[PDB]
Design an enzyme around this catalytic site. Structure first.
Site, mmCIF file in Angstrom:
data_model
loop_
_atom_site.group_PDB
_atom_site.id
_atom_site.type_symbol
_atom_site.label_atom_id
_atom_site.label_comp_id
_atom_site.label_asym_id
_atom_site.label_seq_id
_atom_site.Cartn_x
_atom_site.Cartn_y
_atom_site.Cartn_z
ATOM 1 N N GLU A 227 -10.874 9.500 -14.704
ATOM 2 C CA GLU A 227 -11.025 9.763 -13.207
ATOM 3 C C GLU A 227 -11.825 8.649 -12.513
ATOM 4 O O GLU A 227 -11.553 8.281 -11.370
ATOM 5 C CB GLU A 227 -11.657 11.116 -12.961
ATOM 6 C CG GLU A 227 -10.868 12.305 -13.588
ATOM 7 C CD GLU A 227 -9.438 12.384 -12.976
ATOM 8 O OE1 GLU A 227 -9.289 12.686 -11.767
ATOM 9 O OE2 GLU A 227 -8.476 12.112 -13.698
ATOM 10 N N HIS A 230 -9.368 5.823 -11.788
ATOM 11 C CA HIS A 230 -8.672 6.145 -10.512
ATOM 12 C C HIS A 230 -9.543 5.866 -9.316
ATOM 13 O O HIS A 230 -9.077 5.304 -8.312
ATOM 14 C CB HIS A 230 -8.233 7.648 -10.428
ATOM 15 C CG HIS A 230 -7.057 7.997 -11.262
ATOM 16 N ND1 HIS A 230 -5.867 7.290 -11.231
ATOM 17 C CD2 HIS A 230 -6.914 8.936 -12.227
ATOM 18 C CE1 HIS A 230 -5.032 7.809 -12.092
ATOM 19 N NE2 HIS A 230 -5.626 8.806 -12.721
ATOM 20 N N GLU A 265 -0.636 6.677 -12.823
ATOM 21 C CA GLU A 265 -1.107 7.315 -14.086
ATOM 22 C C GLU A 265 -0.867 6.456 -15.321
ATOM 23 O O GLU A 265 -1.744 6.307 -16.167
ATOM 24 C CB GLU A 265 -0.496 8.721 -14.248
ATOM 25 C CG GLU A 265 -0.934 9.686 -13.152
ATOM 26 C CD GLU A 265 -2.427 10.085 -13.271
ATOM 27 O OE1 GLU A 265 -3.103 9.693 -14.273
ATOM 28 O OE2 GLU A 265 -2.925 10.789 -12.407
#
Ligand SMILES: [Zn+2]
Lengths: 428, 5
Positions: A227, A230, A265
């Protein structure tokens, strides 16, 4: 990676608010929310030990939906993170994961890029005015009870209703465009250090939806690092729109169901997965972002004034010069250097990857993003006898040190409570 | 947000 700790202070949930790093806050555009107790763990980085009923006021209810409405990979518990003791354990768990990440060279690098990744001051209608974008701050209650606006880069919050939500159900922030135009925006990450997923050590088993009970547990540091990666793309405004997808044809079971996986992703996983990103489209994205950075340099060059701040027009021009590694000529003009751009873009998209973190942590982990989850467990990483900064579950000088025994939920059973099995339920 | 499948 870390000599001085990343989180320099031991936080207890019940420590009294001081209006600085322990404070009641509100998030922009969720006005009229009751303030929530928040904890500033590092410059630019806050933790909110509450279930996320705020960021997406479509997701304000924690109660399990109808049984015949729930998907197989979902998990509901409306009482989770509802008590002070839980919130204390959350804060210490998140904190310990940041430290585990910062103790590696890779984590140190990614945390540094993140703190440096201040969302761009492009708020102005006036093209030569530098102005902050309001959504890139939170409102903090001061000791006198008035509000101040504070810029930040990152917020860790609790899950919404679905504690194991595996993809966004509607949106990121609406101007998710800020995540794709070079500017970057403040990032909200739903996450819990109290749950993890079981996977299978054999590739053929892990990528089959009908096999495996989830023998090995994913290290939650990897999940948090995922995360953060990202958030790294998103703070530098280089996220790839989720509508850019791989129509998966390399796994029979994804394919027969027409399953699609976003390039964002695959890039984030890294390893062999990132090669499934069409090379043509990869060159396109990179030119697109380079052009976005040039737009940013010329904005800063045209900049005449700065509002909503006491800081110099020059202190802030230079903050973005450093963020974007811009070049400056003898007349003080900023420009984007192609070698420095290539270096920055590569760091964010190829160096910071899930597959790379796995190497630094020395853990077992899924070998591909294109797999099928097996199970979800309840864990508790807070006690040192359960999990440490340096070793995760695989504690040195114990039976758990070798062969990833501490991630082996059969050997290290006292460390895992299985909550739900996913195998066989998928839709095949 | 993400985990995926
Ligand atoms: Zn992801």
């Amino acid at each position: 990676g870390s000599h001085m700790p990343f989180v320099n202070k031991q936080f207890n949930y019940k420590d009294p608010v001081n209006g600085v790093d322990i404070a009641y806050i509100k998030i922009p555009n969720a006005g009229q929310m009751q303030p929530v107790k928040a904890f500033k763990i590092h410059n630019k980085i806050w933790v909110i030990p509450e279930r996320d009923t705020f960021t997406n006021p479509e997701e304000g209810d924690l109660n399990p939906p109808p049984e015949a409405k729930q998907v197989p990979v979902s998990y509901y518990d409306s009482t989770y993170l509802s008590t002070d003791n839980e919130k204390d354990n959350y804060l210490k768990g998140v904190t310990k994961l940041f430290e585990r990440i910062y103790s590696t060279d890779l984590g140190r690098m990614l945390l540094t890029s993140i703190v440096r990744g201040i969302p761009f001051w492009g708020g102005s209608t006036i093209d030569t005015e530098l102005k902050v974008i309001d959504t890139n701050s939170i409102n903090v209650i001061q000791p006198d009870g008035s509000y101040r606006s504070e810029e930040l880069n990152l917020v860790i919050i609790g899950p919404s209703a679905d504690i194991i939500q595996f993809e966004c159900k509607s949106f990121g922030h609406e101007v998710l465009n800020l995540t794709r135009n070079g500017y970057g925006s403040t990032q909200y990450i739903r996450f819990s250090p109290d749950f993890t997923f079981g996977f299978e050590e054999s590739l053929e088993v892990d990528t089959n939806p009908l096999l495996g009970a989830g023998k090995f547990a994913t290290d939650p540091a990897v999940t948090l690092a995922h995360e953060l990666i990202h958030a790294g793309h998103r703070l530098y405004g280089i996220a790839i729109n989720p509508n850019r997808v791989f129509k998966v044809n390399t796994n029979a079971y994804y394919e027969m169901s027409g399953l699609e996986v976003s390039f964002e992703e695959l890039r984030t996983f890294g390893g062999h997965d990132a090669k499934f990103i069409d090379s043509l489209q990869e060159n396109e994205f990179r030119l697109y972002y380079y052009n976005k950075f040039k737009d940013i340099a010329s904005t800063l060059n045209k900049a005449k004034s700065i509002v909503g701040t006491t800081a110099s027009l020059q202190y802030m021009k230079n903050v973005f010069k450093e963020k974007y590694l811009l070049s400056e000529d003898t007349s003080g003009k900023f420009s984007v250097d192609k070698l420095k751009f290539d270096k920055l873009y590569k760091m964010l998209t190829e160096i910071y990857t899930e597959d790379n973190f796995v190497k630094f942590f020395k853990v077992l982990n899924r070998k591909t993003y294109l797999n099928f989850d097996k199970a979800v467990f309840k864990i508790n990483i807070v006690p040192k006898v359960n999990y440490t900064i340096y070793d995760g579950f695989n504690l040195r000088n114990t039976n758990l040190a070798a062969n990833f025994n501490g991630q082996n939920t059969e050997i290290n059973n006292m460390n895992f409570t299985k909550l739900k099995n996913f195998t066989g339920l998928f839709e095949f | 947000x993400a985990x995926g499948x």
